Amino acid sequence: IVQGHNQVIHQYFDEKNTSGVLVIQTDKKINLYGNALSRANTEYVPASTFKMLNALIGLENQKTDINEIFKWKGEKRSFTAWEKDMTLGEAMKLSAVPVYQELARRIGLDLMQKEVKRIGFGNAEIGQQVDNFWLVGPLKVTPIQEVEFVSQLAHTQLPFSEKVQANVKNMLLLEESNGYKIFGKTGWAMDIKPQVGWLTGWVEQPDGKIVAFALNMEMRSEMPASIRNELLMKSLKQLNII
């Protein structure tokens, strides 16, 4: 059943010379696909995917709001795409680190550690460095843990206000094709051991049904960033999720 599906998806991953897993959660049922299934319960830095929880915490605790404009004071950033004023929602789409760092600072280390622990995100360790704990360690999370987190978000089942959850969900819309809405958040940790690529989110099918996913793969600098999107869409289509 899944073995035919997984044979095809295994091949997708082989064809593009990487080791990756794709975790799918429909409701409470979790299946693994890809050519590196052991990745599914291996911890990795969440990188840019932590922005989902960052936003939830920041909004919940009233440190910002969806309308606030975070102004670019003019300093050069790691990507030219980030060099403009933006809202929290626009920063999510662009993975604009400086905006989310300013947010994390507003929250403070101790509120951050408290919230991360209350929610139970990954190993729930943030250490003492308020602006890179989700990039270089100690914070670590499995792909299975990521899919459960985003599934809960999609079902408005996380322990945050309903409206905060709706607001963060609205920041996460990637793609809308043939009535299927694709929500998600990419992440690419470029400066660590083996580079880590993420793409974590869910599909809202036309009848309202939600199928959540977490792609996690080894990245190499020669890859286009869109290889994560490619492997996701090809797999979802092959699974008839889209």
Ligand SMILES: *C(=O)[C@@H]([C@@H]1NC(C(=O)O)=C(S[C@H]2CN[C@@H](C(=O)N(C)C)C2)[C@@H]1C)[C@@H](C)O
């Ligand atoms: C988060 O993991 C890093 C962040 N994420 C990320 C990516 O997932 O590709 C880039 S965002 C920036 C680089 N390319 C442009 C883009 O949005 N995409 C290719 C999707 C803008 C960057 C590495 C963050 C920790 O730096």
